[PDB]
Amino acid sequence: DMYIERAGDITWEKDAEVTGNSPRLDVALDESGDFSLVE
């Protein structure tokens, strides 16, 4: 059996840690909801 527990508010935080890049990728989505790289 699954259950939920509150973890916080949904708010934008100024001065948050900035990380991550922005890749452009050719992708495909199958009937099962799985993404795959088109190559």
Partner: protein
């Protein structure tokens, strides 16, 4: 049980101890998460029950108590924040500029942040704090890193 707006952890006690299988967003009395997290199963909140209302395996989304309420969209230019809620760790905002998933049916935003699989369902926010989608369905690229789609549902 608790229906206060906010981000929630989705936990299970079937495995060893209490394990976090994912995360969800409670908004307007409706709980929103990814389909792969709950598989459409009912959820407990205190002694209350949250029954599924809408779901779709291809979109990998599910809503509880009512229809999908989240309709904000990434504007295509601005930086966003992932409100990551990792297993056993505190909720943390992480700012990033999304990439793009180019598909045969159009382009989708994509966030390149790496987190444990149990973080699936954590909301992605715009500069106004509006939920533009959920984190947890994406692809594994050459460098073993993970690029998740900004997965959003439709508000009918």
């Amino acid at each position: 049980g608790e229906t206060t707006d906010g981000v929630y952890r989705v936990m299970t006690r079937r495995l060893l101890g209490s394990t976090q299988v994912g995360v969800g967003v409670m908004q307007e009395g409706v709980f929103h998460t990814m389909w792969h997290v709950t598989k459409g199963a009912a959820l407990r909140s205190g002694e209350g029950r949250l029954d599924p209302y809408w779901g779709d395996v291809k979109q990998d989304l599910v809503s509880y108590c009512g229809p999908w309420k989240l309709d904000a969209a990434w504007d295509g230019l601005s930086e966003v924040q992932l409100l990551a809620v990792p297993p056993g760790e505190r909720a943390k905002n992480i700012q990033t500029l999304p990439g793009i998933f180019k598909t045969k049916d159009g382009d989708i935003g994509a966030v390149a942040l790496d987190y444990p699989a149990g973080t699936s369902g954590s909301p992605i926010l715009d500069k106004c704090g509006r939920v533009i989608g959920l984190y947890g369905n994406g692809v594994v690229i050459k460098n073993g890193s993970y690029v998740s789609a900004i997965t959003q549902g439709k508000r009918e």
